[PDB]
Structure formats: C-alpha cells, structure tokens
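Please produce the structure of this protein holding molybdenum(IV) ion.
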Amino acid sequence: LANGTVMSGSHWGVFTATVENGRATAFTPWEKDPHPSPMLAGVLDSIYSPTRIKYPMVRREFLEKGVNADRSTRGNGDFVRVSWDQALDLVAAEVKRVEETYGPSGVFGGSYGWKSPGRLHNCTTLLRRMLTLAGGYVNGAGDYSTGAAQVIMPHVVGTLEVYEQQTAWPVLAENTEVMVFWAADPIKTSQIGWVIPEHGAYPGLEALKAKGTKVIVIDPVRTKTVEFFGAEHITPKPQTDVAIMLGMAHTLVAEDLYDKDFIANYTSGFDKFLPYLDGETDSTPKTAEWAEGISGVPAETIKELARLFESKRTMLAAGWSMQRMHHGEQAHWMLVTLASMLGQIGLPGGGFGLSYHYSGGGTPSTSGPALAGITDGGKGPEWLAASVIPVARVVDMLENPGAEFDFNGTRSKFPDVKMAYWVGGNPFVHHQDRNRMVKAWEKLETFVVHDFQWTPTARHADIVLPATTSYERNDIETIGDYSNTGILAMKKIVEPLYEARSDYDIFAAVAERLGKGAEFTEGKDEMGWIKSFYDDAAKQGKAAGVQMPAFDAFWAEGIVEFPVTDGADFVRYASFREDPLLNPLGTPTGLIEIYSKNIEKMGYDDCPAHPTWMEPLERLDGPGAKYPLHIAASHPFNRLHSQLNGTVLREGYAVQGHEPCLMHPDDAAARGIADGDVVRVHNDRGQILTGVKVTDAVMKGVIQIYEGGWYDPSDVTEPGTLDKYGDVNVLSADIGTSKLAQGNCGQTVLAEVEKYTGPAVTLTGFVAPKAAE
Ligand SMILES: NC1=NC(=O)C2=N[C@H]3C(S)=C(SO)[C@@H](COP(=O)(O)OP(=O)(O)OC[C@H]4O[C@@H](n5cnc6c(=O)[nH]c(N)nc65)[C@H](O)[C@@H]4O)O[C@H]3NC2=N1
Ligand SMILES: NC1=NC(=O)C2=N[C@H]3C(S)=C(S)[C@@H](COP(=O)(O)OP(=O)(O)OC[C@H]4O[C@@H](n5cnc6c(=O)[nH]c(N)nc65)[C@H](O)[C@@H]4O)O[C@H]3NC2=N1
Ligand SMILES: [Mo+4]
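Below is the modeled complex.
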C-alpha cells in the first residue's frame, strides 16, 4: 500500500494530497494560492462519504417492466445491484432502441452540469461523443448563470460580455475612486473556477481596501463583501434594481449632469429612451421618488448615489442574481445604459464589468497558449457549444412535444424526447419547480445517470452507474479561466473505489456495443490522450515564443506557469473609446444600443426595445402579492451548488439537520419563531423544511435559503410531498425570463414561513439507499 504525497487540482483550487496506506488523509492548499477555499476538506471527504456510489444499479420496476414500468415510484430507492456487464448491455440496448424507434430527436443529451475540471475526463463532452456515434441527440443552449444577460448583451454591446476579460485588477487599484458591487458578492463566489481557479480576485480586493477606495454594495444581504470593506450598504427589495437605476438616470437628466458627448458619439437610441424616462409615454416620470415607492430605498439616497457616480471614477461591478429572474434581460441592459450616461466606459478604472465575481475575471492574462481537450466529434466557453433548446425549457419540452417556442427572434418546435442521459449534473436540485418536474419526468421511458454521489438525480434514475472522482484518475487542465496562469497535471491520488469506473471507460464500453469502439477511443489510452493535448499546447507555445518542457519533464514537475507581458494593463473598451470608427462594436450601428431596432422588430411584449420597468410574476410588496417574504435563493457559501452537501462540511451549517434559513429578527418574532427552530417554508408550488438562524444580516422581508440542498421527499408518490431537507427549487417557478432569452427565473420567489409543529421527520438523503450498501 502506497505512502506519499501527490499534487492535483479541482474546481476549488490546486492542492497536495497526503496518502497513507493507499488512502487520502488530507488535502493541503498549494503554497502559491493567495486565498484557499475552506471547502477543500469536504472535497477529500466526498471520495469516501456514506453517499459514495459503490455499484451499478437498476431500478427494480425498470428491470422487471422496461417501458411499462410504473414511473411514479422513481426516487423511492428500490434498486437492484447488477454486474457491470449487465448494466452496460442494458444501457447500450436502450440507447439503440430509442435511436431506431424515435430518431435523434428522442434522446436528450444536454446534460447540463458543473462536473469536474479536466480536458480528458470531461463527462458531458464524452456523453455527446458517444451519442453522436449512436445517431444524434437533442442538446441544450445557454446556461443557468447568465441565461438572460448572455442573449441581450450581443444586441447592446455586440458580444456576450459576461464571459470576457475585465479591466485588470491593478488598473482598478491605481485609478478607481468608487467601486460598486451591484448584486455581487465576490468574496463568496470567487472561491471556485470552471477550470482550476487561481483565486485572483482576493489580492485585487485587498489592494482596493489598502488604497482606501470608497466601496458601495447594493444587495439585500449584508455579505462578507460588505464586511471586508466596511462598505456603504444599500438594501433594495429584491427585483427592484431596474427601478433604482431609472431613478438614478432621471436624476442625472433632471439636474443636467449626464455626459451628453459620450451619449452623442458612442451610443444609439437615447432620444427614444428619454421620453419613457421623463414619463411622456405613460404619464409616469421615473423619478427617484417613484423608485423609492417600488424599491424601498430612500429617494435622497438614490439621488446622492447618482451624483457621486458622475463626479468620481466609478466601476460598476455587477453580479448575475438580478438577471436570474423574470424580465432578467432588463437588469444589465439598464446598467449599461446608466454606465453610458456616466461617460466613463473605456477609461482606466471606469465603466462596468460583469465578471469580477466569477472565476478570477480581472486577473491579468498571461501570454501562454490555450489548452484543448477531447471533443464530441468536431472555441469559446465549452458549455455554449429542433436539435437545440434553451437549457431551462427542459420541462416545458417534456410537457409540450411539438409545440412552438420563441427565442431571440426565431420560432422553433420542441422535440419529442423519450430518454434522457445525465452525467456531471444534478437537475433534481438545479432545475426550478420541483413538483412540476417530478410529474413531467414520467414522460420519459428511460433515465440514465452517472455520478459518484447519491444525489437526488441519481436517486431518480432507472439506471445508475458509479463514476470515479478526478482523484482516482489522471488528467490535465488550465489554471485560470481568464488568467491562463499555467497548466496542471491532475495526477491520480488513489485507486478507483468499489466498482466505480471513469465516465470515459463507461462510454467506451457502450460505444463498443454499438459497433463503434475505435471511433470513440481513437486507439488512444488515458496517458496517450493527455500527452496529445499537452503536445498541441507546446507546439502552439513554441510558435508564440513561450518555452515549454517536453511532456515527461512537465509531468515530473506537475505544473508549467506562463509569463505576464502586457496583461496587467488591459482596459476594457479602451480601443472603442479611443477611436469608435476604426474600432466599432459588433452591433448593427457599431455603437452601444440603448434602443434596439432589431429587438423592436421581434414584437415581444415581455422584452421591449429599450430598458423598461415591468411588473414581475411575483415580488416583495408587489400589488396583490400573495406571500410576504422574498427568498434570496442564491449561491451557497460552503458548497459548489449541490456538491459537497453529503460530506462532513454539512455539520458546520445544518440547523437540526436541515439546510439553514436566515431570517430577520422582526420577521421571526412576528411568527413566534426562535433561533434554531425547524420551520416549514411554503407557497402555492411546494413546501420544504429548513432550520432557522436569526440575524439582521438579511433585510426585513427577505429570507436567505441557498440553492443546492439535496431534495429529500417524504413520499415520492404523494403529489406536493414535503421536502425534509431544504431544496429551495421546490418553491421556485419554472418560467422564461422573456421570449428573447428564455432564461431561468430561479430567484423570482415569494413564500410564507411558519414554525414546524408536524410529526417528527427522519432525514434519508445523506445515507445510501438500503440496497446500495
Ligand atoms: N433557485 C436557483 N438559484 C440559483 O441561483 C441557481 N443557480 C443555477 C446555476 S448558475 C447553476 S450553474 O451556471 C446550476 C448548477 O447546477 P449543477 O447540476 O452544475 O450542480 P452541481 O451540484 O455542480 O452538479 C454537478 C454534479 O456532477 C457530479 N460530478 C462531478 N464530477 C463528475 C464526474 O467526473 N463524472 C460524473 N458522472 N459526475 C460528476 C457531482 O457529483 C454533482 O452531483 O444551478 C442552477 N440552479 C439555481 N437555482
Ligand atoms: N462558493 C460558491 N458556490 C457556488 O455555488 C458558486 N457558483 C458559481 C456559479 S455557476 C455562478 S453562475 C456564480 C453566481 O454568481 P451570482 O452574482 O449569480 O451569485 P448569487 O450568490 O446568485 O447572487 C449574488 C448576490 O446577489 C444578491 N442579490 C439577490 N437578489 C438580488 C437583487 O434582487 N438585487 C440585488 N441588488 N442583489 C441581489 C444576493 O444576496 C447575493 O449576495 O457563482 C459562482 N461561484 C460560486 N461560489
Ligand atoms: Mo452558473
């Protein structure tokens, strides 16, 4: 049995593992990581926790009746252990049956999910590689993070914008006077990366504090970002930011302070927005006082912020929760409109940025080469690659096969899907309106899942296959989504546990049974694939003047780092500002479009041709709103979505075993609720249990229940059954942001809370199904 140390990486950072007698016993942060994540201990625990999946399993009803099975019992845990050979024969036969009977339109292979980093063991790309060989599949477009913003931005500034490099952190330290975090908590969300994170935001934030820059945070919650800077904290009722921005804009026009020259030379359509802002079109001037009535933020505060932003070099750093809501396209469109009025776009330290809270945006880019990995059979964000539906319309598709839907000016039809194959994702936690979804999933004949933890998604599968973690195999990956700091060897730490197999090995075996083995593997093995990716990067590096060692020398060192040349001076939009005729934006006019003729032509009632305030489905203190509290259903501090819920880390935040619910003292007192009580949170769509922590960190009228809790239904056959653990998507609605983007509205949620006085409940989500032990 092995003893020693091994370096590898994850979505949480680079680390060194201590191995004792073949078992990993500790993960220590990389010495060069400026700010390691406390979640590292949970990553290690996830390899061995009680919810680790040991063996391949088939749902008893499916085993016995196939397509004639009772599908309402999916998720009850009645599984049968089978041999790998049995399982693989069955998966291959079902993939082939569905392809022959229903065509490529019958197989949904979108499989949205955060998986693990790695250019070779990329489970969702490996899935599509196999499905391509089987005949084809239906894919998903966009993502749950910026579903609205990523579609409206190309019509406004010409490009995606949310996944692009930001003005560098050091430029902000030397030039910014006022830093605004608008619906962003960079301290919380900078802990992880899509590829390995370098944690570059932490040094950048520390430099702003040491410089004494004024920081303002606009968020309903008093976060660690507020606490780190001792920031001026503005607390708007959730979903009212657009009203606040309009009041600011109206103030700038009324006091004649806005930058008329910037508007004249770099934007288009301000004259069509002005009449709306002044109330000529609807008899409602969008004043600060009007904005106060909707948002609850004092009119004088709105006016003072507007004046301050106009007189100082200001950076508006906005997060994505405010577009993960009904009419979400309006939030960042209005933010860019406000930024245009301020006139600092393209100046060092001024303007706006939509990725300072995500995967190190702003950390200086190096001059190193790009690393490529296995493909599905064929250059931007890898997940953005009737064959395609907007990702959040998956349940609408299941309920309405053949029906039409709108998307970015086109009309398409939903395909008629009969099977879904999910790897590296957890839709039974990430998707909205759980009770609707539970019923909709009965439309599928067959549901196959691969994972290494017994998530709610794996519990609901017909066929579950145990995957390995990254720590039981070898791989290669980039350090830094934007910085490109280096390339890491993700070395094997321990042998595969139980009967777990890599997703690559599973799909290769399924491809073999379809008669397409060599087409899937390309005759290469694990290390042959990894060397081919490295060799390609090195060849590209050589041409650019970056020297890189030979493959075995790189593997022996475990990492290669690249040099920073001019990356620290990057200023976004500087060339556009310098010469807009030589360097125009990718819009129809070449300028920032405040009014879009293109969008006007679409004629969508829920996405007008300029930024507009519209009432959402439900909002805190909205006219005729049924429920009294808004749920800030945001990203977890001590999980990566659902990942790590079934680990030792849960002990640090669970309240009486349930997901925590933060509640203001006055809201708790009105309901006779005390700190630590178990409470039932409910609305017309569902009911869940959570454990309360009383704090004035959350503003009055708002409760915080993070997304990612492992749904643990009392009885799967009972419609609307109580969730015993606390999955906040039991309460959200499943609707599109608008006809333009069809994004998810996971943070448009109102509910009521009462002390739970019902029968005691037993938690079953954190131990494996009895038959799987
Ligand atoms: N109400 C909501 N509010 C929200 O704010 C919210 N966030 C969105 C967003 S923004 C996202 S991500 O753009 C999704 C995340 O859902 P996802 O299914 O990616 O969640 P994870 O908990 O990270 O599931 C990953 C899944 O994959 C398994 N896994 C890891 N490595 C491997 C591997 O190598 N091989 C396999 N077979 N499986 C692997 C993990 O174990 C894990 O289970 O959430 C939205 N919802 C929101 N709602
Ligand atoms: N630790 C951690 N866990 C994760 O799960 C995680 N996920 C990653 C992913 S995939 C993404 S997409 C990003 C998400 O990055 P994103 O900016 O979407 O993060 P959220 O936690 O949903 O919301 C950020 C802040 O918005 C505030 N907020 C909510 N509603 C409103 C509102 O109406 N108005 C205003 N002004 N503020 C509001 C919340 O209180 C929260 O503090 O984080 C990434 N980083 C992550 N880090
Ligand atoms: Mo996301």
